[PDB]
Amino acid sequence: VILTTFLPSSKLFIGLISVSNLFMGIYTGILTFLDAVSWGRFAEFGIWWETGSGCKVAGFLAVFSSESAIFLLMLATVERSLSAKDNHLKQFRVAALLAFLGATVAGCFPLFHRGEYSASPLCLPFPTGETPSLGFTVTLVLLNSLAFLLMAVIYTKLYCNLEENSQSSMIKHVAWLIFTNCIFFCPVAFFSFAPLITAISISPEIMKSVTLIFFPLPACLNPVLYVFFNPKFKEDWKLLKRRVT
């Protein structure tokens, strides 16, 4: 995806989201490598992983990849709304870099707390439950929940606005990304909010298993479907074939 992109405002947004998709994949590969090495002997490396330095690096990488999957997608709906209305292609990238870099401080804030990631091999600030960094887990979920409504209302009005046929392909692509994200991420927080409610009880064996398959999933399917669902991808891919052949 990245080589085909590197210009339209709608084209440059996908390349940066591809970077977050690669970040989530690198995070998952870290865990896969740490799993394949320990054939039944994970506990030997378990203390070395949390008490070393990688438990704070991998967690920060995961937080940065997760929040980029929302911050980058937030501007896509505004871009689509402005595209239907009629020096802006160089001012949107100004906000794009700010949104991309805004997650670094959010991910580093837990690091200032004296011991947050020494509670889970996943080194993520929420599988441990709600006792560690109670004021951070709630805020992170609230930030994700509040952003979805702005994206949903714009896409809702986009269909009613219509009665740029070449631009029709991008409208549905953004809608799929902003809708399927809350299909793979919104159910995740339900299990995190389970141990803090007396009425509903969820076994810990389920929370980790659900997290490990539903956290990297939303940043894994977009690039694959981009090849088979974007007509412009065919021309972009064929353009660079002659530059090397």
Partner 1 sequence: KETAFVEVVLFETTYTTGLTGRFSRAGATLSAEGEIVQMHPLGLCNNNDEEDLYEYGWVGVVKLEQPELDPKPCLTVLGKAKRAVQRGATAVIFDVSENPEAIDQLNQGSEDPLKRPVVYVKGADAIKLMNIVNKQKVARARIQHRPPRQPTEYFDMGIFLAFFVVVSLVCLILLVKIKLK
CA distances from 15 to 11, 18, 73, 98 (A): 7, 5, 12, 16
Q: Tokens for 184?
A: 């793979």
Q: Rounded to the nearest whole angstrom, what is the least distance from the CB of residue 172 to partner 1 in the complex?
A: 6
- Which CB atom, from 133 or from 211, has the smaller least distance to partner 1? 211
- Which CB atom, from 113 or from 172, has the smaller least distance to partner 1? 172
Q: Rounded to the nearest whole angstrom, what is the least distance from the CB of residue 206 to partner 1 in the complex?
A: 7
Q: Rounded to the nearest whole angstrom, what is the least distance from the CB of residue 204 to partner 1 in the complex?
A: 9
Q: Tokens for 210?
A: 């659900």
Q: Rounded to the nearest whole angstrom, what is the least distance from the CB of residue 173 to partner 1 in the complex?
A: 11
- Which CB atom, from 111 or from 217, has the smaller least distance to partner 1? 217
CA distances from 82 to 9, 33, 54, 71, 78 (A): 11, 44, 42, 18, 6
Q: Rounded to the nearest whole angstrom, what is the least distance from the CB of residue 185 to partner 1 in the complex?
A: 12
Q: Rounded to the nearest whole angstrom, what is the least distance from the CB of residue 109 to partner 1 in the complex?
A: 32
- Which CB atom, from 142 or from 183, has the smaller least distance to partner 1? 183
| Angle at CA of residue 23, ends 79 and 136, nearest 5° | 80
Spatial distance between the Cα atoms of 56 and 111, rounded to a whole number of angstroms? 7
Spatial distance between the Cα atoms of 10 and 170, rounded to a whole number of angstroms? 8
Spatial distance between the Cα atoms of 69 and 79, rounded to a whole number of angstroms? 16
For partner 1, the binding residues (CB under 8 A) are 159, 162, 168, 171-172, 175-176, 179-180, 183, 187, 203, 205-206, 208-209, 213, 228
- Quick one: 32 exposed, middle or buried, by C-beta within 10 A (0-12, 13-18, 19+)? exposed
- Which CB atom, from 48 or from 179, has the smaller least distance to partner 1? 179
For residues 158 and 171, the answer to whether their CB atoms sit within 8 Å is: yes
- Which CB atom, from 61 or from 174, has the smaller least distance to partner 1? 174
